[PDB]
Design a protein around this ligand. Sequence first.
Ligand SMILES: *[C@@H]1O[C@H](CO)[C@@H](O[C@@H]2O[C@H](CO)[C@@H](O[C@H]3O[C@H](CO)[C@@H](O)[C@H](O)[C@@H]3O)[C@H](O)[C@H]2NC(C)=O)[C@H](O)[C@H]1NC(C)=O
Length: 141
Amino acid sequence: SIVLEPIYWNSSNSKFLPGQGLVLYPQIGDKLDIICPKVDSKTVGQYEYYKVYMVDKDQADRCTIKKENTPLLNCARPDQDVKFTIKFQEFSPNLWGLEFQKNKDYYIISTSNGSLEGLDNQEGGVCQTRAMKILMKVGQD
Ligand SMILES: *[C@@H]1O[C@H](CO)[C@@H](O[C@@H]2O[C@H](CO)[C@@H](O[C@H]3O[C@H](CO)[C@@H](O)[C@H](O)[C@@H]3O)[C@H](O)[C@H]2NC(C)=O)[C@H](O)[C@H]1NC(C)=O
């Protein structure tokens, strides 16, 4: 029904409010792209690395990820195009697809710290220091 504005997942994006992060209200059927940091020749900045995960409320609050969690976005090519389209669909086409329900809250965070060495860190990171997290209040407002 509508393509929401894309979310650029990087430390210079102001949509992430201090402390609170980003809060959205997507509706079933909408789509949203999460775009990995990309540096080329007209985009100034240092390589930024992140693993982005869908997690539960508790994990978001504590900025932690369990080793059973699998990234929905693995930003490991700071020099290329890497993005993930979240489709707020009720039914997934496969085992790895996402499914959403109306009037349900979903969270996305990264406990990576932006550096190559902290890509796999499972606690803190930008979730904790820069509020780089997203709350999606599906089917609401
Ligand atoms: C970090 O996130 C920034 C967004 O908060 C992002 O800025 C946005 O970058 C995109 C990609 O370059 C720009 O895209 C637009 O401009 C290009 C060039 O003309 C067009 O081809 C596209 O179609 C599109 O219109 C956005 O304009 C820009 N938005 C803002 C607010 O500046 C940074 O690029 C990200 N930085 C890194 C290092 O990934």
